[PDB]
Amino acid sequence: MEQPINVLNDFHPLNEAGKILIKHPSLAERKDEDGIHWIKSQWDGKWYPEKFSDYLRLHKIVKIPNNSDKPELFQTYKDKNNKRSRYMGLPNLKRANIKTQWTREMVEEWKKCRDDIVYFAETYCAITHIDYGVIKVQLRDYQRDMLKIMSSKRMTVCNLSRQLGKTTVVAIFLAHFVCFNKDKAVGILAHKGSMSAEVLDRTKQAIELLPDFLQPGIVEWNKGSIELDNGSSIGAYASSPDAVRGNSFAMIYIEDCAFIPNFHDSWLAIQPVISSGRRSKIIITTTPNGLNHFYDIWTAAVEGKSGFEPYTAIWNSVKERLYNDEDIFDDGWQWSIQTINGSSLAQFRQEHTAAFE
Numbered sequence: 354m355e356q357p358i359n360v361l362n363d364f365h366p367l368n369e370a371g372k373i374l375i376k377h378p379s380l381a382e383r384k385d386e387d388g389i390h391w392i393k394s395q396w397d398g399k400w401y402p403e404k405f406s407d408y409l410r411l412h413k414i415v416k417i418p419n420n421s422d423k424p425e426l427f428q429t430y431k432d433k434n435n436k437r438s439r440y441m442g443l444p445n446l447k448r449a450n451i452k453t454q455w456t457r458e459m460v461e462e463w464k465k466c467r468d469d470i471v472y473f474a475e476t477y478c479a480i481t482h483i484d485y486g487v488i489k490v491q492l493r494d495y496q497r498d499m500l501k502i503m504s505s506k507r508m509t510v511c512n513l514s515r516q517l518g519k520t521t522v523v524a525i526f527l528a529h530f531v532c533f534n535k536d537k538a539v540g541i542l543a544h545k546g547s548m549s550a551e552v553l554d555r556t557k558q559a560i561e562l563l564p565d566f567l568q569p570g571i572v573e574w575n576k577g578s579i580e581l582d583n584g585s586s587i588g589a590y591a592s593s594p595d596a597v598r599g600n601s602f603a604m605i606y607i608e609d610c611a612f613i614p615n616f617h618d619s620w621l622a623i624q625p626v627i628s629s630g631r632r633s634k635i636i637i638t639t640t641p642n643g644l645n646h647f648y649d650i651w652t653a654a655v656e657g658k659s660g661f662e663p664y665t666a667i668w669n670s671v672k673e674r675l676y677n678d679e680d681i682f683d684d685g686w687q688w689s690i691q692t693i694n695g696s697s698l699a700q701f702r703q704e705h706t707a708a709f710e
């Protein structure tokens with residue numbers, strides 16, 4: 354007699370020792386509904402179509418309407434044809450201090466965006482589709498949760514895995530912050546100034562696609578910073594105490610925190626900012642890098658020993674990974690095995706499961 358009767362013959366390297374970290378898909382609940390077969394995921398308890406074709410089919414493909422002739426359709430309207438209203442002849446950018454008249458519905462739609470960040474993102478923000486082109490973004494569940502937390506909590510620390518599309522949500526969040534808040538100076542810090550400039554570029558891209566009524570008048574538009582008519586701005590800097598002390602930020606965003614050398618001095622400098630009577634917001638995102646400065650920040654937050662709200666998302670947050678090479682749902686069995694085999698368990702744990710090793 355070989356292994357017992359009712360024991361699966363499929364094994365996974367992630368289930369390295371007596372502990373089952375990933376359950377085989379054949380053990381999952383199944384059901385038929387809406388004319389197709391569904392399988393329940395062990396990662397979020399949600400139902401997913403068995404066929405990738407259905408998973409894709411169920412996604413809404415909607416383009417960002419191009420309308421520069423009907424102001425009555427203010428939601429998609431942008432007066433680019435009339436260069437006068439344009440910021441230095443720039444078609445997609447609105448000029449500052451341009452006295453304008455609004456209707457009642459316009460004020461309500463503007464307020465709705467100001468108070469519902471997720472609605473704002475999925476109605477006026479977009480991503481580029483390889484073939485369908487530039488379309489409205491359908492936020493992944495983790496992106497939706499991340500947006501809500503960054504917006505509702507004063508200070509947030511995010512421990513993420515790699516390649517989750519997090520820059521997309523950060524850009525949207527920053528665009529939302531400066532477009533619906535007045536006199537807010539935002540500072541983006543990273544190891545290298547060029548890294549911060551990239552985060553700023555993604556944020557500028559989001560603001561550029563916005564319709565006239567949601568888009569603030571542009572006052573400044575540089576590679577290292579921008580300023581809007583409402584007095585809000587964003588600046589890209591290289592992390593250092595000087596950069597922190599050098600400006601009075603209403604919000605500081607730190608990119609890839611665990612990979613910033615000697616971040617300790619920057620962290621110390623940020624303490625007065627945190628404890629300031631102005632109630633500044635602090636947002637940190639990064640993938641882990643061992644037991645260094647970030648591990649200390651993360652642990653304090655998880656332990657509830659600081660004012661930071663912890664948030665985490667790992668490899669299974671990207672649902673396309675839950676379908677195998679044959680376009681069949683397998684809850685990520687194959688994707689994780691190939692990723693581990695192509696690297697190692699240690700690399701996978703750190704890069705894809707946000708472990709501190």
Ligand SMILES: Nc1ncnc2c1ncn2[C@@H]1O[C@H](COP(=O)(O)OP(=O)(O)OP(=O)(O)O)[C@@H](O)[C@H]1O
Binds near residue numbers: 492493496515
């Ligand atoms: N919710 C989403 N729906 C569809 N596509 C998305 C979504 N979020 C991100 N993407 C796509 O993922 C791609 C990469 O995203 P992004 O640049 O944010 O990744 P990142 O956070 O910089 O990390 P990495 O570059 O390592 O993936 C983009 O081309 C974007 O179109």
